[PDB]
């Protein structure tokens, strides 16, 4: 569910941020709190594995609650979709809101294991 | 080190975790535990005190109406039963079972501490030996278990956790010789509340009357004689017994002693009354104080008829008291700071009050929407009798009950309020006004029930009334039983 | 004008309850209930009796307001007797009741002049200690008691009515509850320890009560402004003609909702917006401002909702409309409804309507199934506790992995409601019909 | 009534609702007040667009779709209502509680309640507006959660 | 012992004696007989709902007796609180158990459900005996 999703990221968050350099509520407030908490700006970048695997109702739900940290001016999300069937299935399981949202920056990269011999 | 969550408000007692089977070397080395300064018994009350500035006027009534408080005329048979096995098993220095079950408010704790008191002071005779008290209220638990914290600190003083209590209890119970002990009688009140999925609860403190060595009374109080044989096993049904003591409900001859007991100083008894403050002083105005003999007789009749509770007959005539010194006091005007009879006029009016249903003059006394919804609801449950009617079908019945009625003065003038709340700008709307607001009302009352559905068209509601008293309730309304 | 917005205070200080305990405002339908709370009271705080009633009535009708009002009186002359523990159902479970009792009472007795240290067990041990020249009455108010009479055990109501019957200190318990049959959810044990005073609330029973209660509410008794006595002319002459305004929104309110708290957060904006006295006074001889208010509390509604959809988006609705109507079990998908909508756009064009495309249709369903037009077949939907609602979010629903084409819906509004409030000008309204 | 109504296109009822209900002193303001309406109706343009126009006004602001469930909501809750004290009275010397510790609705009320009791030396009674811009939008709702906040102030003390 | 010593070698009546104290001797016919006419009338119409609905809370139990005792116009009727009333004197009596359940329908909340643990052969023979008001049972 996006709760444990949340939680998971949150907490691989504050493990980075504390093994690099007081408890913490692991939700995204800590995201708005990060430059108060660690004196830097914060680039998270999303690996979702298996992109084909996953419920799309979650992910939708989560990728609308990743939109919520845009207004806070010190952090950057970056988000890598490992797709294995084709672009335009990941296309129909999502709103159309998510992929307008998507569609102000995005690139396609093909990697294959034959992607040109 | 980062935590994945935290617990930040852990609370935890001062228990030891050792049991008592490793507090000596030996069963030799083992003391006289009677003499010993913490075993057998050997600060809250003032914080609840203050300085009174004021002087209370107690009226003639409200002697009557305290000694009518909770806080033994018609148990002999079962104190003597009682009191003979716990005496003979006292005496005689061996562990039994007691079983003592009834319905609420028959005497049954009232007898087991009164039997506890006689032979309290037997022993301070030296009748019979010395024994401790303990008594176990299952439903006081916080956790089934803190009974084996609670009994063993009764015995030894100290604070172990549970599982070393019982280890302890067991240990207490079964290795330590009847020389270096105390006899025990414990008060298992609330059986029925200790009794858990494992059972391992009942069958310890009933397997410990079992042991040569264990010097224990357990009384168990129930509610149900058959508690055994319906929720435990053969193992504690075999070690409680076949002798079990039940407590009837009382008889209205019994209640009617019980009564005249609390009111023996008080009933037919003269009072000097101050008639400028109300106050009265138990032998200004000579009065004199009386209640009926057939009000009494009623309320023990219709107590004894419906439970043979003590507690019920007692709060009965305090109502009624109440009720006679609440009209005594509004025609006199006392206030807080030639003969006074609470009569059988109050005692029918105590009685009737908790027989009154409220459901009928609830449902009279709603508005237009309201009844309407319960009507169109009555409507659709004669025409299909399913008795679960979506909705959208009352929505529609609602619909069809207003057109079709359109002609009557009353509808007449209320279709514009029903569907455009009386203004023109406002649009014809879909549901009548206050649809949600009345929908809510009746499933807080409790009179409606309704299924966690999220399509409102199809979620189905449920009369949770009687349907009869619904539908009296809709003929007393005038414009629902002329259309 | 500082006399205007005196008085402007006032009557919002009045609408809102927030006056000084000897100027409260008792409606005279709720006076012989409140007398009675009002003995109560004074039998526990003053004359030390124990006692133990349920106010039965449902919500927002003076339970709370009436207990307040009986507590700010008696602390007013008698502020040393008595403490009070204040639990509410909702927030408070079975093991938070126990905490919330000994933190009141340590922070009440510190007030009049630990017992909530320790494990759970221990803080039980105490309140137990402490509860089984004068006594300090404790005061108990228990709202939504229903939720600590359940079906499983009932053991904090056991131990506060052993506390009301066999204790010596003096202690004063009110329950408040919505349930009419609230002496049914209770145990037999805990029924017989109970006293069985059962008090239902009063109700508005006729037209006058409400217009009695409106005059209480709107009078100025005090001599604040300039414009006292003429706002209470005004007030007056308002509420004594049968065809005012006022009495047609008093009226409409009786037939309908029957509460005074709806009928007063309509007229504190009519207060509040008021500029001068000219400006109030025209405003509650018209009461214009109570119908732009009632037009606005509909306008989230399904009439309302209907009326900001687009062209395309009603064609969508209505094609899944009948549809389903069609349909033996009321269900729908994507695919249905986009057939039946391109069978209603060549029959229209037949007789010109940009035909758009399934994969831009796609949005106008994602829009209405947001705006809460079409509902997934046999969804639940909000749980009713935290439980459940923790139960289902760890389950994977059949609707969320198949493709959105073949979801099954239903309609939250069926084709008879469209054709009934679609215009007839509108040139979709043929197809409501069957 | 002492306040500001901004002119804002299309909403000038709801801006004067606005007024009407919200405002400094605690005797004319309801406990609870809510907006409703769909996405995009402009409903935090609007209460933005007045809370700004009303400086003097203390607002904390709260997006309960960054918090998900309820637990977070309340320690949210008791942060940032600590935190705005803090910086609106830095002359008042305060016990710092920790927002982890609320684990309950009942700790959330024992932690507002300890919170509060330090500051009685303020002359004049003081609304502190807490806005749950989204409540219904929290991904673990259901229906008994919104009781709690709206009972929420029966239970804290009346004469702070 | 203990029967003996509260009274005054132990005889063969002692040990009858203790299988009579301490044996609850049900007894249907003899519970019936300390009956009302009236209650009587309710318990047939609580048993008639329980053959016929199977699982009936107290009330519907309540809306049969009323529509049964209308069809018969005589012992004009009672409401539903004394209703609940003589179902309370039936469970002093040791006829009726109330207990809270849960529906089995879609509606799935709590609510008190009526049930019996009488035999149905004296039951049919006591009022058989009483041979006036007939179609009850
Ligand atoms: N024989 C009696 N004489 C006088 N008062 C009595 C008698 N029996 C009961 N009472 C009164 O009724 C009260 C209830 O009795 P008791 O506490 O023993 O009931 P119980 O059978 O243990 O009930 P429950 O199962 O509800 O605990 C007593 O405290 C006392 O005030
Ligand atoms: N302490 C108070 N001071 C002023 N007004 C109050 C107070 N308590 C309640 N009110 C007002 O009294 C009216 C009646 O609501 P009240 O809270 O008394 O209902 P209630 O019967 O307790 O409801 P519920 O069952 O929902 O708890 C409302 O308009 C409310 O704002
Ligand atoms: N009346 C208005 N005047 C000017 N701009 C407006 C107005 N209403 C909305 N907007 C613009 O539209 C944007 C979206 O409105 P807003 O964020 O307030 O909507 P909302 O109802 O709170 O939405 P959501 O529920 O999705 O959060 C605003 O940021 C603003 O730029
Ligand atoms: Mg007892
Ligand atoms: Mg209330
Ligand atoms: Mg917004």
Redesign the interface.
């Known amino acids: 569910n996006v709760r444990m999703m949340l939680r998971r990221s949150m907490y691989k968050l504050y493990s980075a941020a504390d093994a690099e350099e007081n408890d913490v509520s692991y939700d995204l407030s800590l995201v708005e709190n990060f430059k108060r908490l660690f004196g830097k700006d914060l680039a998270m970048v999303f690996n979702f594995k298996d992109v084909d695997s996953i419920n799309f109702n979650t992910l939708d739900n989560f990728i609308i609650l990743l939109k919520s940290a845009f207004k806070y001016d010190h952090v950057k999300i970056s988000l890598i979709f490992n797709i294995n069937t084709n672009l335009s299935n990941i296309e129909k399981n999502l709103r159309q809101s998510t992929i307008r949202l998507l569609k102000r920056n995005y690139h396609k990269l093909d990697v294959s294991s034959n992607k040109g011999f | 080190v980062i935590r994945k969550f935290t617990k930040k408000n852990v609370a935890r007692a001062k228990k030891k975790y050792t049991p008592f089977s490793k507090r000596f070397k030996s069963i030799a080395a083992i003391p006289d535990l009677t003499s010993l300064p913490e075993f057998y018994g050997n600060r809250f009350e003032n914080k609840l005190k203050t300085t009174q500035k004021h002087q209370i006027v107690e009226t003639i009534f409200s002697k009557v109406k305290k000694q009518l408080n909770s806080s033994l005329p018609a148990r002999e048979n079962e104190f003597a039963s009682i009191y003979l096995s716990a005496y003979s098993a006292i005496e005689s220095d061996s562990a039994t079972t007691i079983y003592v079950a009834g319905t609420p408010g028959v005497g049954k704790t009232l007898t087991v501490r009164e039997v506890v008191k006689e032979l309290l002071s037997s022993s301070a005779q030296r009748e019979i030996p010395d024994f401790l008290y303990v008594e176990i209220n299952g439903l006081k638990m916080v956790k089934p278990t803190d009974c084996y914290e609670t009994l063993w600190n009764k015995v030894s003083g100290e604070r172990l956790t549970w599982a070393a209590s019982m280890e302890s209890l067991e240990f207490y119970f079964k290795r330590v010789p009847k020389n270096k002990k105390k006899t025990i009688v414990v008060l298992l009140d609330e059986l029925d509340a200790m009794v858990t999925k494992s059972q391992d609860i009942m069958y310890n403190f009933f397997n410990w009357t079992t042991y040569e060595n264990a010097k224990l009374i357990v009384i168990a109080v129930a509610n149900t004689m058959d508690l055994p044989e319906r929720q435990l096993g053969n193992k504690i049904t075999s070690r409680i017994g076949f002798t079990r003591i039940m407590f009837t409900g009382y008889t209205h001859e019994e209640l009617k002693n019980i009564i005249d007991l609390r009111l023996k100083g008080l009933n037919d008894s003269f009072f000097y009354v101050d008639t400028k403050t109300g106050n009265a002083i138990l032998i200004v105005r000579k009065v004199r104080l009386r209640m009926s003999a057939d009000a009494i007789e009623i309320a023990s009749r219709k107590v004894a008829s419906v439970s043979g509770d003590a507690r019920r007959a007692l709060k009965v005539c305090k109502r009624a008291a109440e009720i006679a010194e609440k009209h005594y006091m509004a025609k006199h005007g006392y206030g807080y700071d030639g003969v006074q009879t609470v009569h059988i006029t109050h005692v029918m009016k105590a009685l009737n009050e908790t027989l009154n249903s409220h459901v009928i003059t609830f449902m009279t006394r709603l508005s237009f929407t309201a009844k309407l919804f319960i009507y169109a609801l009555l409507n659709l449950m004669k025409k299909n009798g399913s008795q679960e009617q979506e909705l959208g079908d009352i929505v529609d019945e609602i619909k069809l009950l207003i057109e079709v009625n359109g002609s009557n003065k009353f509808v007449m003038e209320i279709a514009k309020t029903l569907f455009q709340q009386g203004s023109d700008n406002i649009s014809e709307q879909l549901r009548i006004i206050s649809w949600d607001f009345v929908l809510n009302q009746l499933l807080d009352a409790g009179i409606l029930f309704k299924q966690t559905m999220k399509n409102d068209r199809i979620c189905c509601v449920k009369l949770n009334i009687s349907v009869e008293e619904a539908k009296r309730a809709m003929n007393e309304d005038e414009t629902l039983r002329n259309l | 004008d500082p006399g205007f917005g005196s008085l402007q205070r006032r009557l919002l200080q009045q609408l809102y309850g927030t006056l000084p305990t000897d100027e409260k405002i008792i409606f005279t339908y709720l006076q012989d209930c409140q007398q009675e709370i009002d003995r109560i009271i004074k039998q526990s705080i003053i004359q030390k009796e124990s006692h133990s009633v349920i106010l039965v009535g449902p919500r927002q009708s003076y339970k709370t307001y009436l207990l307040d009002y009986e507590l700010s009186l008696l602390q007013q002359s008698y502020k040393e007797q008595f403490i009070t523990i204040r639990l509410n159902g909702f927030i408070h479970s079975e093991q938070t009741a126990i905490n919330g009792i000994a933190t009141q009472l340590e922070q009440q007795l510190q007030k009049i002049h630990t017992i909530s240290s320790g494990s759970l067990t221990e803080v039980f041990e105490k309140i137990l200690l402490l509860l089984d020249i004068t006594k300090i009455t404790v005061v108990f108010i228990f709202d939504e008691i229903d939720t600590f009479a359940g079906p499983v055990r009932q053991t904090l109501l056991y131990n506060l009515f052993d506390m009301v019957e066999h204790s010596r200190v003096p202690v004063c318990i009110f329950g408040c509850t919505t349930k009419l049959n609230i002496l049914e959810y209770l145990e037999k044990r805990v029924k017989s320890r109970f006293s069985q005073r059962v008090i239902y609330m009063p109700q508005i029973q006729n037209l006058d009560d409400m217009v009695d209660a409106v005059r209480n509410l709107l009078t100025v008794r005090s001599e604040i402004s300039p414009w006292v006595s003429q706002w209470n002319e005004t007030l007056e002459k308002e509420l004594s003609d049968p065809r005012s305004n006022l009495n047609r929104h008093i009226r409409m309110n009786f037939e309908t909702f029957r509460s005074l708290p709806t009928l007063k957060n309509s007229i504190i904006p009519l207060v509040a917006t008021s500029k001068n006295f000219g400006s109030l006074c025209t405003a509650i001889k018209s009461c214009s401002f109570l119908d732009i208010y009632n037009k606005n509390q509909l306008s989230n509604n399904l009439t309302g909702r209907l009326q900001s959809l687009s062209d395309l988006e009603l064609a969508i609705l209505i094609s899944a409309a009948r549809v389903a109507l069609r349909a033996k079990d009321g269900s729908f998908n994507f695919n249905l409804a986009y057939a039946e909508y391109e069978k209603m756009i060549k029959a229209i064009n037949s007789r010109t309507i940009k035909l758009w495309l399934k994969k831009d249709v796609k949005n106008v369903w994602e829009n209405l199934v947001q705006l809460d037009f079409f509902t997934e077949k046999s969804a639940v939907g909000l749980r009713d506790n935290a439980t459940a609602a923790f139960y289902a979010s760890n389950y994977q629903f059949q609707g969320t992995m198949i493709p959105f084409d073949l979801r099954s819906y239903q309609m939250q509004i069926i084709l008879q409601e469209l054709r009934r409030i679609i215009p007839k000008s509108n040139m979709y309204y043929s197809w409501t019909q069957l | 009534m002492n306040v500001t109504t901004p002119e804002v296109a299309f909403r000038e009822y709801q801006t004067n609702c606005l007024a009407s209900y919200i405002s400094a002193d605690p005797d004319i303001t309801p406990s609870n007040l809510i907006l409703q309406g769909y996405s995009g109706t402009g409903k935090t343009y609007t209460l933005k667009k007045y809370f700004n126009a009303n400086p003097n006004l203390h607002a904390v602001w709260l997006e309960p779709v960054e918090l998900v469930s309820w637990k977070p909501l309340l320690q949210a809750i008791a942060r940032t209502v600590q935190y705005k004290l803090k910086t609106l009275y830095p002359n008042i010397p305060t016990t710092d509680y920790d927002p982890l510790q609320v684990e309950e609705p009942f700790l959330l009320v024992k932690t507002l309640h300890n919170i509060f009791v330090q500051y009685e030396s303020l002359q004049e009674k003081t609304c502190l507006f807490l806005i749950l811009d989204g409540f219904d939008s929290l991904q673990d709702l259901d229906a008994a959660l919104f009781n709690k906040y709206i009972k929420l102030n029966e239970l804290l003390p009346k004469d702070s | 012992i203990?029967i003996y010593?509260?009274e005054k070698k132990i005889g063969l009546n002692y040990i009858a004696k203790?299988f009579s104290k301490?044996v609850?001797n049900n007894s249907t016919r003899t519970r019936i007989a300390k009956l009302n006419i009236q209650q009587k009338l309710i318990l047939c119409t609580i048993i008639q709902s329980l053959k016929l609905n199977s699982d009936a809370t107290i009330?519907?139990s309540?809306?049969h007796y009323?529509?049964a005792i209308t069809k018969t116009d005589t012992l004009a009727p009672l409401?539903?609180?004394?209703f609940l009333?003589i179902c309370?004197?039936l469970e002093?009596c040791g006829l009726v158990s109330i207990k809270?359940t849960k529906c089995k329908?879609?509606?799935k909340?709590?609510?008190?459900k009526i049930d019996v643990d009488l035999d149905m052969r004296e039951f049919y023979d006591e009022m058989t005996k009483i041979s006036i008001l007939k179609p009850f049972l």
Not at chain 5, 79 to 82: D, L
């Open positions: 203990e010593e509260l203790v301490f609850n009330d519907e309540f809306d009323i529509k409401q539903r609180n004394e009333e309370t004197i002093t809270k329908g879609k509606t909340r709590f609510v008190d």
